[PDB]
Amino acid sequence: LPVSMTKTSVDCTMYICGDSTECSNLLLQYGSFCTQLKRALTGIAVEQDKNTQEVFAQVKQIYKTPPIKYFGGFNFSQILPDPSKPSKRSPIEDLLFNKVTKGLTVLPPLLTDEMIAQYTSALLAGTITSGWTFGAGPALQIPFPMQMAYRFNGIGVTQNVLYENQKLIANQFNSAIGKIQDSLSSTPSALGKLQDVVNHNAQALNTLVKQLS
Amino acid sequence: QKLIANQFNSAIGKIQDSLSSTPSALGKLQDVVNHNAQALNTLVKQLSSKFGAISSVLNDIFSRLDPPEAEVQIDRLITGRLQSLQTYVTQQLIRAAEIRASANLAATKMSECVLGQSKRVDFCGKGYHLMSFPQSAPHGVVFLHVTYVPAQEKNFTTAPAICHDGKAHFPREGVFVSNGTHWFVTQRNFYEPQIITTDNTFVSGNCDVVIGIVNNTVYDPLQPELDS
Amino acid sequence: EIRASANLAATKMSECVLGQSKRVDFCGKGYHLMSFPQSAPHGVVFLH
Amino acid sequence: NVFQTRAGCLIGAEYVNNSYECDIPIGAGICASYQSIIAYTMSLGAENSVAYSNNSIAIPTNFTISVTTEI
Ligand SMILES: *[C@@H]1O[C@H](CO)[C@@H](O[C@@H]2O[C@H](CO)[C@@H](O)[C@H](O)[C@H]2NC(C)=O)[C@H](O)[C@H]1NC(C)=O
Ligand SMILES: *[C@@H]1O[C@H](CO)[C@@H](O[C@@H]2O[C@H](CO)[C@@H](O)[C@H](O)[C@H]2NC(C)=O)[C@H](O)[C@H]1NC(C)=O
Ligand SMILES: *[C@@H]1O[C@H](CO)[C@@H](O[C@@H]2O[C@H](CO)[C@@H](O)[C@H](O)[C@H]2NC(C)=O)[C@H](O)[C@H]1NC(C)=O
Ligand SMILES: *[C@@H]1O[C@H](CO)[C@@H](O[C@@H]2O[C@H](CO)[C@@H](O)[C@H](O)[C@H]2NC(C)=O)[C@H](O)[C@H]1NC(C)=O
Ligand SMILES: *[C@@H]1O[C@H](CO)[C@@H](O[C@@H]2O[C@H](CO)[C@@H](O)[C@H](O)[C@H]2NC(C)=O)[C@H](O)[C@H]1NC(C)=O
Ligand SMILES: *[C@@H]1O[C@H](CO)[C@@H](O)[C@H](O)[C@H]1NC(C)=O
């Protein structure tokens, strides 16, 4: 799911008239079109920043996973952050990053990718260690197999189904996550919903620039 | 009951004080109004622009020039003003679409959170949702979400099941806990110990397959009655 | 359009991740158990 | 009093090693505020490590009836 696009800003007089002073003198009496366009683009930029903040910053705590990463057979190494990498990112999100490629300026986002990765890591640690209680108040730690048993109780299956098939469920989950990793590494168009976003915005700018000719 | 009532009264009092003492909390609605006013003002300013004509007043053009080129000047003025009006209408349409989306969201919230209880997380307030109240406001609606939040958590030792007489007893609705020596069962969101009996636990298989099972006795209410 | 999509993504994060959703097909095909978020260039990827 | 940021060059405010919440957004993780004008790296939130273990649970013992407003 896309969240925010590239924030762009325009210098109205510089784009319209360039370095001709008489052009600016003639321009100043067409009114406040430049002010309107600057206001609209600033509104879009702040809306993009608010969108990112709302979608990601949903927890007021930055939880940290315990050093001993054993969860009753479940393997979360594919989605947990990798300490060795300087970027502090899991293999899946690193694959995602590697899989996606005057008068007009591009403003950088307020939240860098590192802070977004930190929020995602906090959410993962919270939802792994403390179930779903951390989203409704304090964080309540709980063993992971018990959380999965609770989640089966959510869908109308008693816990004895889980507790007597824990190893099989763990193996199936690990195999499924490996298959997802390989599928992401194999299909190029799977990220199209994001890619076209860029492939839209950039080309739009190009067309605008072509209008100078 | 009395404690919950007191907490609710204190909460609504704090809400009233917070709304009274914080002016920025009502920013959203305020913004709406400002935007509209701003737009109108900008439109008026467009009447003060020459748009490249010799003057920005139609009367001056008419009383100063003959029709043959006064019509050219008036053509320029009309096309400029028409472009400005087109821009204003387009901006109004976009803002109206945004307000339509917000109104649809508000209607969904009114239908679900009000007149009902929602299991959706954070859709009707932070924490477990209890109920809600609507209030009107200039060009908007304010929801008071009354919600339930746990506090004063306490550590306990847990086992997935209880092995007794070779049978594995699992909790029916709650969870097994241990205050250090004894084993009880209690519901998930509140602490209320109960004796592990055969009515709140159910038997499923033997105790050789589950991982982490502990040994304990399971009280039976029928045995004392059959003793007499 | 992007803001509407971001609102949808925020709802998905609030429901599928921080809780269990009983809404059919909202958090993946089948009976939903849980989910994980991941970042991506100008977007978020949910593993249901 | 010159600072180099990803967005650009900032003059008139002093960088502070301390971290707070964002007040005026500048960009690239930098936010400025007035307390003199100081620019800093915004703080995501208070870190809270939860003691997770495979045979321990935490059970609430009390509750609170909260009321929130949404406009
Ligand atoms: C969890 O999964 C990871 C990777 O999915 C496992 O790491 C692999 O370990 C084997 C043997 O030690 C190596 O041959 C592979 O190269 C490793 N994979 C990677 C990506 O480095 C790990 O063993 C699994 N189990 C645990 C407990 O972490
Ligand atoms: C349950 O027990 C754990 C550890 O026995 C407690 O975690 C400790 O909390 C204190 C409180 O500040 C910290 O100083 C320690 O560093 C924590 N220990 C670890 C290993 O992280 C936890 O607080 C207990 N639960 C409650 C509700 O008191
Ligand atoms: C765990 O709870 C049990 C049940 O209340 C406690 O056992 C009781 O303790 C009280 C306090 O001394 C005694 O008056 C009762 O006679 C005990 N009942 C039984 C059946 O033993 C137990 O003490 C608690 N654990 C701890 C460490 O205090
Ligand atoms: C729970 O009780 C069972 C039987 O009452 C224990 O199983 C016995 O364990 C001892 C010591 O390992 C063996 O010598 C016996 O042969 C076992 N008997 C049976 C029938 O399995 C079991 O060990 C107890 N649980 C724990 C954690 O000690
Ligand atoms: C649960 O919390 C409530 C309030 O948060 C506690 O009620 C307070 O109790 C103290 C001591 O008895 C009084 O001084 C306060 O006035 C009470 N508050 C209110 C609002 O009446 C209650 O005691 C707590 N429950 C437990 C078991 O500790
Ligand atoms: C449970 O946790 C303890 C310490 O946290 C560890 O020593 C033990 O190996 C774990 N048991 C399993 C079955 O993973």
Give the C-alpha separation, B144 to B118, whole Å: 14
Distances in Å between the Cα of B226 and the Cα atoms of A72, B18, D44 are 43, 63, 64
Cβ atoms within 10 Å of B24's Cβ, excluding its own: 6
| Burial of B37 per CB tally in 10 Å (0-12, 13-18, 19+) | exposed
Return all residues near B108 (Cβ < 8 A) that are at least 6 apart. none
Question: Does B100 lie at the interface with A, CB-CB under 8 angstroms?
Answer: no
Which residue in A has a C-alpha nearest to residue D60's C-alpha? A140
Phi, psi of D67 (to 5 degrees): -125, 125
Give bridge partners of residue D62 from the DSSP assignment: B151
Asked if C19 and A132 count as a contact pair (C-beta separation under 8 A), the reply is yes
DSSP-derived 3-state class of residue B42: helix
Q: Are A92 and A184 in contact (CB under 8 A)?
A: yes
Breaks (C-N over 2.5 A) in chain C follow: none
Resolution (A): 3.7
Q: Report the candidate in B101, B137, B133, B108 with the shortest Cα–Cα distance to residue B123.
A: B108
Is B176:A178 a contact under the CB 8 Å cutoff?
Answer: no
Residue type for A186, please?
A: S
Distance between CA A129 and CA D51 in Å, rounded? 8
For residue B220, what are its two tokens? Answer: 């039976």
| Alpha-carbon dihedral angle through residues D13, D17, D20, D23, given to the nearest 10 degrees | 20
Nearest chain A Cα distance for residue C20, angstroms: 7
Residue A55 near residue C10 (C-beta atoms within 8 A)? yes
Of B114, B103, B46, B110, the closest CA to residue B80 belongs to: B46
Using the Cβ of D9 and the Cβ atoms of chain A, whether some distance falls under 8 Å is answered with no
3-class SS at B182? coil
Residue A118, classed as helix, strand or coil, is helix
CA of B179 to the centre of ligand 3 (A): 9
Assess C24–A contact: CB distance below 8 Å, yes or no: no
Q: For B27, which residue in chain D has the nearest alpha carbon?
A: D71
Nearest-CA neighbor of A122 among C24, D45, B199?
D45
Residue B213 burial class via C-beta count within 10 angstroms: exposed 0-12, middle 13-18, buried 19 and up: buried
Instruction: List the structure tokens of B34.
Output: 């400002």
- CA dist., res. C30 & res. A77, Å (int): 25
- Which residues fall within 8 angstroms of residue B95, CB to CB, at 6 or more apart? B35
Q: How far, in Å, CA of A203 to CA of D7, rounded? A: 23
Atom 22 of ligand 5, nearest CA residue? D62
